[PDB]
């Protein structure tokens, strides 16, 4: 079956994606409340911090796939990669990132996430040094379409192949069917060198989430399907953890049942 | 301590209502591949399919009145010892093992197990093999530092351990859970294997006139607990409860599967 139709549907829906609302729905309290150790924020940050602390994920270059208007996914990573490439389909998201990069006041304040990262990394790093390091190591913010055989376009900047990939809430939020998800994964995988690592975070059993006016339709995937897709793309799953969304965190911004975190290494 | 508040509650535990609430439709319908029944069986079948879990002697901690958790396992261990706190449960297990009247019909699960393993084995041989390899059904208390305790007809130390929905369901708190995990880890010989299945974020469940208070545990908490007990988590999976399998018998949010090895 042709993908174009579904892809065109996805592309269209995102043209109504709103950064501001997106950030508030998912990265402001209650979801953006890092105080409760059992919330989703802390758990995500713990997964990333702990994986990097094994020292097994290192290199020079890293590419964040579908960054959106967020940087939390790179807080623990920036102390291990000198060259970081951020990416997103939407220009308005790339501007939102540019806004934070310029330390402008009208930008989202990630300090809460930064402090927590420094907190669990346990190196007595103050969050300001942490944010400073990230801003310095983000070498580029590029456009991307995971549905293309070459997601970054052709002859794009991004040093290739990247030593590591990081991607949160992208693949499953932009793929019509499960076959698309698998294809999307194979496409970004061509950006990672053999032996490289992939840090993937995502929503489990989700069909919709809100980005302001947007009521984006998402393909629900399970742990089993993610694991299966990772192996089908040539990865050895090194770690796959699941977080069950608590009742108090089901604010009505989406219908997500859980969140997965996968650490896979390209074979 | 004082833990024994649970002990009293389990005195009203009715094996039949338990079987009916968890192993009869809808949860007991194995036709849906996305149901919990199928998921649990795949977890067990795939693990034993790797061929790394083998030996003589295997112990099933807190078997209750169920045998499904041993369907795939019984073809890798010639000496199987099942266990449980209540005498009522041990009698229900006996009713199935001795093929007595009023025994529970596990055929659906046996068939599914045979279907999954894909060895062309009919379910009657499967049950026959399980019935023969189960030598005895002994009492147990995962809270007593020596569960089976003293001179036990159980060939300890065992080579592998299987336990489903026991630890989190008989412990009042996380610490009591962690300690109980140590009490059973003793029965397992070093380099041995533990196959652990349990409820995720559940606080209560019914079994007839019995209302049980369980310690809600997360996957993260279960892993960390496995380590602190001297294990090397080989695999950990989570099954999120579908709305249609969320009935009035409990408040379970999901189910976890853990494949761990005592190092
Ligand atoms: N075809 C496509 N290829 C790549 N990214 C896409 C895409 N279509 C939409 N996206 C982007 O995927 C993102 C999903 S939202 C996830 C944002 C962020 N990574 C976080 O963790 O919160 C949006 O930023 C959206 O613009
Ligand atoms: N102190 C204790 N030590 C071990 N098992 C106990 C216990 N107190 C209660 N139990 C038993 O633990 C069981 C929990 S119900 C789980 C039954 C079965 N394993 C299944 O998968 O369905 C009950 O059969 C109960 O009698
Ligand atoms: Cl924790 C978290 C953060 C962001 C998003 C989600 C979750 Cl659960 C699910 N909807 C897509 C965006
Ligand atoms: Cl699938 C299944 C089987 C048994 C039990 C449960 C579940 Cl979800 C939860 N309550 C404890 C007993």
UniProtKB/Swiss-Prot annotation, chain B:
One of its GO terms (biological process) is methylation. Changing residue 95 to C: No significant effect on protein expression and enzyme activity with octopamine as substrate. Its EC number is 2.1.1.28. CDD domains: AdoMet_MTases (cd02440). It holds the Pfam family NNMT_PNMT_TEMT. The keyword Ribonucleoprotein does not apply. It catalyses: phenylethanolamine + S-adenosyl-L-methionine = N-methylphenylethanolamine + S-adenosyl-L-homocysteine + H(+); (R)-noradrenaline + S-adenosyl-L-methionine = (R)-adrenaline + S-adenosyl-L-homocysteine + H(+); (R)-normetanephrine + S-adenosyl-L-methionine = (R)-metanephrine + S-adenosyl-L-homocysteine + H(+); (R)-octopamine + S-adenosyl-L-methionine = (R)-synephrine + S-adenosyl-L-homocysteine + H(+). One of its GO terms (cellular component) is cytosol. Signal peptide: none annotated. S-adenosyl-L-methionine binds at residues 18, 23, 62-63, 68, 84, 89, 141-142, 164. Catalyzes the transmethylation of nonepinephrine (noradrenaline) to form epinephrine (adrenaline), using S-adenosyl-L-methionine as the methyl donor. Other substrates include phenylethanolamine and octopamine. Also methylates normetanephrine. This is Phenylethanolamine N-methyltransferase. It comes from Homo sapiens (Human).
């Amino acid at each position: 079956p042709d993908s174009a139709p579904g892809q065109a549907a996805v592309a269209s829906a995102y043209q109504r994606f709103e950064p501001r609302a997106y950030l508030r729905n998912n990265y402001a309290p209650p979801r953006g409340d890092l105080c409760n150790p059992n919330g989703v924020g802390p758990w995500k940050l713990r997964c990333l911090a702990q994986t990097f602390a094994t020292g097994e994920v290192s290199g020079r270059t890293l590419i964040d796939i579908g960054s959106g208007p967020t940087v939390y996914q790179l807080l623990s990573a920036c102390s291990h990669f000198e060259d970081i490439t951020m990416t997103d389909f939407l220009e308005v998201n790339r501007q939102e990132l540019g806004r934070w990069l310029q330390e402008e006041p009208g930008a989202f304040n990630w300090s809460m996430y930064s402090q927590h990262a420094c907190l669990i990394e346990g190196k007595g790093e103050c969050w300001q040094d942490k944010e400073r390091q990230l801003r310095a190591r983000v070498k580029r913010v590029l456009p991307i379409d995971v549905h293309q055989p070459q997601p970054l376009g052709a002859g794009s900047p991004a040093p290739l192949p990247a030593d590591a990939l990081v991607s949160a809430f992208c693949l499953e939020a932009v793929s019509p069917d499960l076959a698309s998800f698998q294809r999307a994964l194979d496409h970004i995988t061509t950006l990672l060198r053999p032996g490289g690592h992939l840090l993937l975070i995502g929503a489990l059993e989700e069909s919709w989430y809100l980005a302001g006016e947007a009521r984006l339709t998402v393909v629900p995937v399970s742990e089993e399907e993610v694991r299966e897709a990772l192996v089908r793309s040539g990865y050895k799953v090194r770690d796959l953890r699941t977080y069950i969304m608590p009742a108090h965190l089901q604010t009505g911004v989406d219908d997500v049942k859980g969140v997965f975190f996968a650490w896979a290494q390209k074979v």
